[PDB]
Amino acid sequence: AMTLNVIDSHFHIWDPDAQDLPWLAGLPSLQHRYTVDDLAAEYAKFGVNFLGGVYVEVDAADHELEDRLLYENASPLILKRMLQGRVSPWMRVPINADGIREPLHRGRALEPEFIAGLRAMAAKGLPFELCNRGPELGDMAKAFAQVPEVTVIIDHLGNVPGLDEESCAALAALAELPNSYIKVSGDNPVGPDIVKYVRDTFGPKKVLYSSNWPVVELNSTFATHFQLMLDTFGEDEDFFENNARRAYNID
C-alpha cells in the first residue's frame, strides 16, 4: 500500500429497486444499492491509487436494461464492461460492451457454435469471461485450446474444489494458452494451497487481481481479502494493474 496502482479486474454494481436480480433472494446482506463510488471509497481507505475497475454482468433479468444502465453510467472508474450474451458466430453483442460473459450454469463448451463464436470474438477484440462449475474445467481446456487467439479470463480461480487430479490437469492446460488469464477471487476466501499452485503454473504475467466486490462481503470482507492479496503477492505491479492492461487491452 506504499503508493500502489490497482486495477480491479472483477467487480459488480446493482440497484435492487431499478433492477431485477433473481439470485439476490435469500441473501438479505446484498439487497442494497451498490455504486462505483462505494468501491472507490474502499480503495481510499486502503491508500492505493484506484485506476478503475472492470464491470462484470450481474446476471440481471433484463439484459437490455443492464446494457442501458451501464452506458448511462459514464463514471471514469468503469474501465471495461463485460456484458452477458450467448457465444455464437452470430451473437448479439452490445455496441458499448468491451467483452462477453456467458453464465455457464450441459456440454456447452463442446458445441461447434461455441467454438466458432470464440473465433468471432477474437477477430473483434472481445475477451471472454469464463465462470463455470468445478468438474467442467476439463472441457473448457479443450474448447479454448482450439481457439488460442481469443482472450479467456478464468473467473474465481476456476471455481475448483481443491487439489483434484482432474482440476490440476485442466488448470495446467489452460496455463499453456498464450491469451489465458486467471483471477484470484471467488465467493469464498481463497485457499492458500490453490493460490500457490495457480501462481506457479500460470506465472506472474497471467494472474489478475480481483476483488469480486461486493460479493466478497458475503463469506469474507474486502479488507480481509485485499490484505491477504498484499501478503501473498506484495506490491506487485503486474498482479495489480499491468496484467489487466494486456488481458482487457486497457490503454
Distances (CA, A) of 163 to 85, 131, 135, 171, 209: 31, 19, 12, 10, 21
**Per-residue DSSP letters for 78-138?**
EEEEEEE---STT----TT-SEEE------GGGSHHHHHHHHHHHHHT--EEE---STTHH
Cis peptide before 189 (omega within 30 of 0): no
Of 33, 29, 129, nearest in space to 85 by CA: 129
Task: State the pairing for strand pair 49-56/99-101.
Answer: unpaired
Distance CA 158, CA 127 (A): 16
Q: Are 130 and 155 in contact (CB under 8 A)?
A: yes
DSSP class of 52? E
Q: Are 131 and 103 in contact (CB under 8 A)?
A: yes
Expressed in Å, this structure's resolution amounts to: 2.9
Distance CA 120, CA 154 (A): 19
Distance CA 232, CA 251 (A): 27
Of 202, 209, 213, nearest in space to 239 by CA: 209
Output the nine-digit C-alpha cell for 13: 454494481
Task: Report how this structure was experimentally obtained.
Answer: X-ray
3-state SS assignment for residue 40: helix
Query: Helix H segments across the chain?
Result: 36-45, 63-71, 112-124, 137-146, 165-174, 192-202, 216-219, 222-232, 237, 243-247
| CA-based radius of gyration for the chain | 17
- Residue reference for cell 490484505: 227
CA 105-148-59 angle, to 5 degrees, is 25
3-state SS assignment for residue 8: strand
Length of the chain: 251
Distances (CA, A) of 189 to 106, 186, 193, 223, 225: 28, 7, 12, 12, 7
